[PDB]
Amino acid sequence: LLQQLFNKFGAISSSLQEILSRLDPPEAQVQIDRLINGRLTALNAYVSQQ
Amino acid sequence: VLNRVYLNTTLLFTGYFPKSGANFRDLALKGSKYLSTLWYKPPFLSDFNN
Amino acid sequence: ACQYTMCEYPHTVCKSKGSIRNESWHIDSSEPLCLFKKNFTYNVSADWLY
Amino acid sequence: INSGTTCSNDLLYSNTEVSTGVCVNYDLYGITGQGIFKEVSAAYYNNWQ
């Protein structure tokens, strides 16, 4: 579960700071939405397994 | 790896390596007095993909 | 790494005892445009280099 | 202009301010993050690393 925070999931980076430093606030939300969806999916799968 | 240090472990790394079990290609040439033309052809002018 | 005026039949000359021909892989004595320039060192007595 | 190497760097802050003990933001040679630094003696860095 800790290694899920190093997947890109379709975004250009796995880092929330390399997106906010290198993209405009319109263009950053498209990548932050993909990271949010990938990490929420990982948490749902873990919660069902428990 | 570029400027990274790894210590007492194994690493699974995707990179740019030779294929294990492939052969080489001697392209060195030693002239003495003359300068050919068939030396300068797509036999010796080669490709660069990766 | 520069844009050079490349010869048709390029070749070199050993800088220990000179040969019949001259080292001429370009004729560009006007300092052309360059992307990169550097100098590195290696062991003079080592046999194999990769 | 606008093609070559003689650049007017204008770098953020290559400050000699490695402050140990507290949380900082870092941009170390391209890698970004946050963390607490703590000085040590280490004998495994070659000159390319």
Ligand SMILES: *[C@@H]1O[C@H](CO)[C@@H](O[C@@H]2O[C@H](CO)[C@@H](O)[C@H](O)[C@H]2NC(C)=O)[C@H](O)[C@H]1NC(C)=O
């Ligand atoms: C890299 O090294 C080469 C060879 O040591 C340098 O070329 C010499 O440059 C000086 C000054 O321009 C000339 O007087 C010599 O005749 C050159 N030697 C040869 C063999 O060409 C070169 O300048 C160095 N490059 C850098 C960026 O320092």
Ligand SMILES: *[C@@H]1O[C@H](CO)[C@@H](O[C@@H]2O[C@H](CO)[C@@H](O)[C@H](O)[C@H]2NC(C)=O)[C@H](O)[C@H]1NC(C)=O
């Ligand atoms: C302007 O450029 C100078 C170039 O000298 C910068 O000062 C250098 O900073 C580095 C980083 O520690 C040192 O290694 C150099 O020794 C410094 N130069 C000197 C002459 O001491 C400076 O930081 C730059 N400032 C701005 C505002 O761009």
Ligand SMILES: *[C@@H]1O[C@H](CO)[C@@H](O)[C@H](O)[C@H]1NC(C)=O
């Ligand atoms: C070798 O690597 C293992 C990896 O877990 C580590 O536990 C061990 O301490 C290492 N050996 C030394 C001498 O540091």
Ligand SMILES: *[C@@H]1O[C@H](CO)[C@@H](O)[C@H](O)[C@H]1NC(C)=O
């Ligand atoms: C090599 O260059 C020198 C000086 O320009 C010249 O005298 C000599 O004839 C050249 N060699 C050949 C084979 O042309």
Ligand SMILES: *[C@@H]1O[C@H](CO)[C@@H](O)[C@H](O)[C@H]1NC(C)=O
């Ligand atoms: C490498 O260089 C060192 C010093 O420059 C020398 O002592 C050593 O013999 C060299 N080894 C080879 C294989 O060239």
